[PDB]
Write a protein that binds this DNA or RNA. Structure first.
Lengths: 12, 49, 121, 284, 126, 379, 127, 49, 422
RNA sequence: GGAU
């Protein structure tokens, strides 16, 4: 995952 | 045999290594080149060398 | 689509989809019919959401039966695309579940939406 | 299209090579009435494309020439099909060539003390290395950049050999450019460092110390910047000239450094101590 | 009861012994269960057997839970048929894979040696 | 060796080039895009804040930029020098949006409207002749600020006169329509829910007659259609299929803000309609319960910019959440171009996009105040 | 650099003609030196470019990269006539003496033209 | 009327067609056995349509 | 070159001479019917007996097989060895064997063929010498167990390198890997030549065409992104369609129709190529099913055109050829069916051709327009020529009725065209 | 597009 705390990112 | 301005150069086809170059620069640029065995005929202005 | 009952109205769909989008961010959302089924088996679901337009609708008609037996709230939305949209996935979701968490930061409106769904049923 | 040359294959294959002023060479199988393959842009169209293309008598090797100062040889490999080989004709492959600058060279320099190679830059935006022996070996310096179209033509160039094989040993200046690029003769490839004038000026003078450790860059705005060849890191900056600096030299002793500029003054500096030893003004 | 179950259980319904033993002993779990004897699983090979089992079971629920909860199901099996085609398509592309890398056609770098050839003489013309 | 069935064999012999030359072709290739970068527009004079908005002059070769620096920096874009024409600092007015305007009838009229997070808006006739609009004539409650405003052309059919109108976004589904010159409150329009975005479509009626339609959308996906030639009355209502959290909306294929007209006859209808969302899907609709033609999914963040080519062949869609979040879509194929943008393409946090009326130039602004210019060789 | 790609005073030195780029299109304009004209000739094609500027005694001869020469009247604001060479190569220079008009192409071919007769007189190449 | 108007009208007239991608015809092999080739061409058309 | 490489060539030349005992078992152990141990136990005479009976069964299925009894399956062929045969006599064997594989081409599913082909393998070592012709022939049976048996016994040529993985492998080659072999440009020329012979010999059959068609269409897909290679596919693959179209066989023609459509959708081509494409399609269009496929392929090609002249009238020669093979009633029936593909561009050219060349069919123009909705610009072009017709052609009832049809539909556009033209 |  993005893991900025997970950054708001769409799953494709 | 390839023309280079007022002089010509000879390359070996197998290796493209220089073999001979014209001893002197022609008074005029060469227009045509003909090679026949050990002789090459060069044309410039009204003289064929 | 007479089978899907009760079907939330346009306004009611708003708050539900809003909570679903929130629950997605806080990892309190379970997406998919079987994954929704597992929550009901484990009794960890606040309530179950389904999509009315899904064809065949029978693919989700089991969840009402589980929900009624377990006394879990349930409700239907018109569009499955919009459901998967709020879930935060690139594919349509025909059903999803909100996991039970009394320590969550989004608890209050879940109960509020739950209380309305109680009224709808 | 316009035919410029013709030649037949005398190696036992009914093949005809047709050359075009567009720079394209096409091969046609006369027996099968089909096009074998086309070589595109072998020679520049602007310079007449293929001026002459000839099959060697009794060999699968064809020589191609043009006005772009290049001679190339192409060979037709044996078929990889055990049968029906005439159908399965391999495309001609590059074998060897000789070439040089397509336009008159702008700058030259002697590569080594032994005088076996020359560095040459031309307006065709290419830096070339030419042998001075019968081999006539010629190569174009690779411009593929290191990671940390052609570049503009070179206006200045300096070379040293004190530290060849260890790091970059050539510096050049590009027209209308605010930084200098490095070249490495051992690798025949672009260096991994770029030097900027740091004064919003174009590079007009380039020089390197005999030890090969310091690179001297002259800006159009009158500033002189000092870089290290191996680390490419700016070390010192000298600002005496107010106009463009046209010449920069460090004596082999690495003590006294000389500079001159369009303003007409000649600057004398102590490289070790970084002091202005003296200033001389000339008439022009 | 089976229809009420999720697809996850359906694939591993017949290997509870291996399942719960594996869960408690920190060991790999069954992946075929009772569904191993289906024709589609037989067609698959190697690790693809596990894949088709999961895919088949998901569609097994789809086909099943139509049958159980249908008010006016036609006794035709159409949903199963389209479901079957999807799995077959999944199997085909899955089996179409080659884990083993393809070998490239070798083109070795060989060498040409010039050979002298007879040429007609123009002196005879003259 | 020394209709006819062998025709196709002969034509293959004639040429070794079989790809049709795209020069004669006027439809751009579906997947391959021919783009070359040019020099930056602001390189002559940098901006000290983000480029909040970009706008090309309809006819003159001028580009307008705005941002929180509070200056209207206008550049003469030529692709090689891009020098600055003039700049106009507006103290105490952060610039959220700016645009050129030309009266559809009086071509000599040129004006610039700029607004921000304030209860006033400035107009600039073309020392500077600047004027402030700050009176709503009783509708002050509905509006809190003019930060979001678009300019359109309104035809008064009963007199056949044409004039500009300034559109504003209200606090609760409200849209306020003001006179471009007189600033007079002409009409007001309402929708249910929070207004998120709106646009304008023009539908020609006859010779010299056209109607302007306001398209408004709620975050949910209800879309309202208002007839401004009939006192802003509803004319159509429909929902974006699969729509939730709508963010932006725009039309293409005809006249619009990006592609304004010069006379009445040039008015054309838009055949395309696209709608954004915070997640990043864009539902494309063919304006010619509607169903989207395509549902783009390439970007994964909120749709902050969505613009159509003047000819309606390319959709340029961008997002400000992450860097390099810019994609170009071919139409009507609805296929995203692959060759461009690349990893090395400098885009950063895209925040402003602009299409030139002609010549196929792209201007893209970022947070850093850099406007990077490109050319489409197809045009 | 400068926006003015090319410029030229008239022989009297009283009027300056300059060519500049609007978007991807070059525009030609004239202004009065002693002392605003907003009328510019526009090249409708992006590829087209102005290679030569030459005043005439109120017309200016315009050499194109297309391989043809245009005669432009400032007053009318349109090209009155276009002299087209056989070759499409760009014109490198232009010069005038009364009716005599001489141009050169990228092929290094000399050409001669007559303004009164609007004809190509002769074309030749010198080694 | 102007030529650019005709050009834009022609552009508008153009309509979309589904493009051929990587995995469009792989399934043809699965159903290539004992199929009338007319039906094969028809299926190719259907997927192409 | 190294002595090993130069020596390696020597081994290939005499790979089949059967020098010592050890080499003999490898050569003789090769078998398509039986395993290695039993194969070594066999003798030529026993092989001849089985093969002779097998051909007799094959002869009943197809009389052509009986001829090989005189040359290949003769008793004296038992005493014939290839190693002891001279250069000229060897090609004659190569001609005879190559012919035989072609007649085996449509029958391998039959058991007797394998018995018959065994004798050629064991007597004439075709798997060693005539390797390529055997693979190219059997290529469409790649799921079939026979093909697996081939790979185990045979040394692949350099071009068939992709199949080395499936040699002596339990799984058969996948359809994906077959694409890769065809993707090679060189192999396409091999299969090109092989296919050309079959067309000349009329030996093509559906399963060949089905597999043959199924593959190149994928090669279009696999190269879809890379335009430059797609260009390199034009000379070779289109040339296939030329031969296939020239064939009388309806299956060959319709096969070419499948080929042509996908490239046009895949690649934009010059109209002249597409113009040239039509004449061939229409020149040898005889079978009923061929017209239906052709009348679909024709319109699809016209849909691909996206340049000036997209809907211009067809040439004179093209127009008369088309109507001869497709009467006006037929295309009317084509426009009657509701499931018609998009064909507006073809019709617009077709209608303009009618006006240019025939005065009688104008009343069909009215019917054609009603059936199909044409594009906005396309209608305008139809206005433009018909205006010229009124000025040139004498005013007819059908002519004015055509005007009246457009007066009813979009009256304003009629004025614009009239305004622009007079 | 980049490393390799």
């Amino acid at each position: 995952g993005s893991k900025k705390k997970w950054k708001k990112q769409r799953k494709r | 045999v390839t023309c280079v301005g007022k002089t010509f150069q000879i390359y070996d086809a197998n290796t493209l290594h220089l073999l001979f170059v014209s001893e002197k620069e022609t008074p005029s640029s060469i227009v045509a080149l003909s090679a026949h065995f050990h002789y090459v005929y060069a044309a410039y202005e009204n003289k064929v060398g | 689509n007479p089978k899907a009952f009760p079907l939330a109205d346009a306004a009611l769909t708003q708050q539900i989809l809003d909570v679903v989008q929130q629950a997605a961010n806080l990892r309190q959302l379970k997406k998919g019919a079987n994954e929704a089924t597992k929550t009901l088996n484990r009794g960890i679901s606040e309530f179950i959401i389904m999509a009315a337009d899904c064809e065949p609708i029978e693919i989700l008609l089991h969840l009402p039966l589980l929900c009624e037996d377990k006394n879990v709230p349930y409700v239907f939305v018109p569009s499955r695309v919009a459901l998967g949209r709020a879930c935060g996935v690139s594919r349509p979701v025909i059903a999803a579940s909100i996991t039970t968490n009394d320590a969550s930061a989004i608890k209050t409106q879940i109960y509020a939406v739950k209380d309305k769904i109680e009224t709808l049923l | 299209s316009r035919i410029s040359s013709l030649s037949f294959r005398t190696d036992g294959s009914s093949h005809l090579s047709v050359g075009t002023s567009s720079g394209d060479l096409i091969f046609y199988d006369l027996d099968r009435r089909s096009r074998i393959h086309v070589l595109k842009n072998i020679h520049r169209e602007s310079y007449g494309g293929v001026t002459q293309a000839t099959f060697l008598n009794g060999q699968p090797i064809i020589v191609t020439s043009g006005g772009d100062n290049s001679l190339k040889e192409y060979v037709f490999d044996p078929s990889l099909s055990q049968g029906s080989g005439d159908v399965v004709v391999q495309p001609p492959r590059y074998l060897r060539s000789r070439g040089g600058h397509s336009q008159p060279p702008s700058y030259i320099a002697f590569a080594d003390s032994q005088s076996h190679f020359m560095l040459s830059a031309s307006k065709d935006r290419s830096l070339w290395s030419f042998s001075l022996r019968k081999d006539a070996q010629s190569q174009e310096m690779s411009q593929r950049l290191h990671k940390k179209s052609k570049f503009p033509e070179i206006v200045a160039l300096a070379i040293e050999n004190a530290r060849i094989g260890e790091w970059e040993n050539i510096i050049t200046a590009h027209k209308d450019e605010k930084f200098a690029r490095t070249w490495d003769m051992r690798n025949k490839r672009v260096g991994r460092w770029t030097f900027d004038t740091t004064d919003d000026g174009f590079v007009k003078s380039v020089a390197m110390s005999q030890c090969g450790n310091f690179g001297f860059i002259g800006s159009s705005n009158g500033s002189i910047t000092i870089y290290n060849m191996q680390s490419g890191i700016l070390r010192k900056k000298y600002k005496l000239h107010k106009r463009a600096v046209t010449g920069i030299s460090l004596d082999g002793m690495n003590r006294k450094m000389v500079s001159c500029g369009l303003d007409g003054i000649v600057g004398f500096y102590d490289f070790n101590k970084s002091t202005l030893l003296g200033k001389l003004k000339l008439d022009a | 009861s089976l229809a009420k179950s999720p697809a996850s259980t359906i694939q591993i319904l017949g290997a509870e012994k291996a399942l719960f033993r594996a869960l408690k002993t920190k060991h790999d779990t069954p992946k075929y269960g009772l569904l191993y004897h289906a024709s589609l699983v037989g067609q698959a090979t190697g690790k693809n057997k596990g894949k088709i089992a999961r895919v088949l079971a998901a569609k097994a629920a789809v086909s099943l839970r139509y049958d159980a909860l249908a008010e006016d199901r036609d006794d035709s099996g159409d949903i199963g048929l389209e479901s079957r085609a999807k799995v077959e398509n999944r199997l085909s592309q899955l089996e179409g894979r080659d884990l083993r890398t393809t070998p490239k056609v070798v083109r070795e770098a060989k060498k040409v040696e010039m050979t002298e050839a007879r040429a007609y003489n123009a002196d005879a013309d003259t | 060796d020394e209709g006819d069935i062998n025709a196709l064999t002969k034509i293959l012999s004639t040429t070794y080039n079989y790809k049709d030359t795209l020069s004669n072709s006027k439809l751009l290739p579906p997947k391959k895009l021919d783009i070359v970068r040019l020099k930056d527009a602001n390189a002559s004079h940098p901006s000290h804040s983000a480029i909040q908005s970009l706008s090309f002059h309809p006819s003159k070769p001028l580009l307008l930029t705005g941002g929180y620096d509070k200056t209207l920096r206008i550049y003469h874009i030529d692709g090689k020098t891009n020098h600055l024409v003039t700049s106009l600092h507006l103290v105490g007015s952060p610039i959220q949006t700016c645009t050129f305007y030309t009266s559809l009838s009086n071509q000599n009229q040129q004006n610039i409207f700029t607004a921000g997070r304030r209860r006033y808006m400035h107009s600039w006739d073309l020392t500077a002749k600047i004027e402030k609009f700050s009176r709503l004539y009783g509708h002050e409650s509905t509006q809190r600020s003019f930060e979001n405003f678009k300019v359109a052309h309104l035809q008064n059919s009963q007199t056949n006169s044409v004039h500009g109108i300034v559109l504003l976004q209200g606090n609760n589904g409200w849209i306020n329509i003001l006179h471009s010159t007189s600033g007079l409150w002409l009409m007001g329009c309402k929708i249910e829910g929070v207004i998120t975005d709106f646009c304008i479509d023009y539908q020609p009626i006859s010779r010299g007659k056209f109607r302007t339609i306001l398209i408004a959308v709620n975050a949910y996906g209800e879309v309202w259609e208002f007839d401004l030639n009939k006192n802003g009355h509803v004319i159509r209502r429909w929902k974006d299929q699969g729509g939730v959290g709508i963010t932006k909306i725009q039309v293409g294929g005809g006249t619009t803000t990006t592609c304004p007209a010069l006379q009445i006859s040039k008015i054309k209808q838009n055949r395309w309609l696209a709608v954004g969302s915070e997640s990043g899907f864009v539902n494309l609709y063919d304006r010619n319960t509607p169903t989207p033609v395509a549902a783009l999914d390439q970007l994964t963040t909120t749709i902050s910019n969505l613009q159509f080519s003047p000819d309606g062949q390319i959709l340029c869609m961008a997002s400000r959440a992450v860097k390099d979040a810019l994609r170009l879509v071919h139409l009507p194929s609805c296929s995203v171009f692959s060759n461009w943008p690349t990893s090395g393409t400098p885009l950063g946090k895209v925040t402003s996009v602009a299409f030139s009326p002609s010549g196929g130039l792209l201007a893209v602004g970022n947070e850093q105040g850099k406007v990077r210019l490109w050319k489409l060789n197809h045009y | 650099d400068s926006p003015v790609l090319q410029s030229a005073y008239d022989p009297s030195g009283q009027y300056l003609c300059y060519v500049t780029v609007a978007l991807d299109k070059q525009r030609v304009g004239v202004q009065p030196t002693q002392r605003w004209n907003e009328n510019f000739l526009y090249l409708e094609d992006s590829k087209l470019k102005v290679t030569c500027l030459k005043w005439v005694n109120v017309a200016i001869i315009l050499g194109m990269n297309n391989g043809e020469i245009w005669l432009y009247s400032v007053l009318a604001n349109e090209v009155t006539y276009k002299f087209t060479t056989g070759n499409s190569y760009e014109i490198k220079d232009i010069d005038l003496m009364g009716n005599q008009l001489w141009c050169i192409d990228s092929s290094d071919a000399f050409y001669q033209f007559d303004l009164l007769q609007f004809k190509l007189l002769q074309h030749f190449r010198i080694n | 009327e102007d030529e650019e108007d005709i050009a834009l009208e022609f552009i508008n007239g153009e309509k979309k067609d589904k493009l051929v991608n990587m995995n469009s015809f792989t399934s043809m092999f699965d159903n290539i056995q004992n199929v009338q080739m007319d039906t094969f061409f028809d299926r190719v058309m259907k997927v192409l349509t | 070159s190294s002595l090993s490489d130069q020596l390696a060539q020597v081994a290939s030349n005499n790979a089949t001479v059967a020098l010592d005992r050890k080499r003999r078992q490898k050569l003789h152990s090769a078998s398509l019917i039986y395993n290695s141990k039993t194969a070594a136990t066999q003798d030529y005479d026993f092989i001849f007996e089985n093969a002779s009976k097998a051909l007799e069964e094959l002869s009943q299925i197809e009389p052509k097989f009986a001829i090989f009894s005189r040359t290949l399956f003769s008793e004296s062929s038992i005493s014939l060895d290839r190693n002891v045969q001279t250069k000229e006599e060897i090609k004659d064997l190569d001609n005879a064997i190559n012919a035989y594989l072609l007649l085996a081409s449509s029958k391998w599913y039959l058991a007797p063929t394998l018995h018959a082909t065994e004798w050629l393998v064991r007597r004439f070592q075709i798997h060693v010498k005539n390797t390529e012709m055997l693979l190219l022939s059997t290529l469409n049976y790649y799921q079939t167990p026979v093909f697996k048996r081939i790979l185990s016994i045979i040394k692949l040529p350099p071009l068939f390198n992709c199949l080395s993985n499936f040699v002596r492998s339990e799984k058969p080659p996948t359809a994906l890997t077959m694409i890769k072999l065809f993707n090679d440009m060189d192999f396409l020329k091999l299969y090109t030549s092989y296919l050309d012979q079959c067309i000349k010999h009329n030996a093509t059959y559906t399963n060949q065409l089905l597999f043959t068609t199924c593959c190149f269409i994928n090669v279009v897909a696999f190269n879809s992104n890379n335009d430059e290679k797609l260009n390199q596919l034009v000379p070779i693959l289109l040339e296939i369609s030329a031969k296939l179209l020239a064939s009388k066989s309806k299956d060959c023609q319709i096969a070419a129709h499948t080929i042509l459509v996908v490239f046009a959708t895949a690649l934009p081509l010059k109209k002249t190529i597409i113009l040239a494409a039509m004449e061939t399609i229409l020149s040898n269009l005889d079978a009923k099913e061929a017209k239906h496929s052709a009348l679909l392929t024709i319109c699809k090609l016209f849909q691909t055109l996206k340049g000036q002249g997209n809907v211009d009238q067809l040439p004179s020669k093209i127009f008369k050829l088309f109507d001869s093979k497709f009467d006006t009633v037929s295309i009317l029936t084509f426009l009657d069916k509701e499931d018609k593909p998009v064909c507006d561009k073809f019709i617009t050219s077709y209608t303009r051709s009618i006006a240019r060349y025939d005065r009688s069919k104008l009343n069909i123009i009215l019917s054609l327009l009603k059936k199909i909705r044409l594009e906005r610009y396309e209608v305008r072009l139809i206005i433009t020529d018909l205006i010229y017709l009124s000025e040139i052609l004498e005013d007819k009832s059908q002519l004015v009725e055509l005007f009246e049809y457009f007066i009813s539909i979009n009256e304003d556009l009629v004025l614009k065209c009239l305004k622009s033209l007079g």
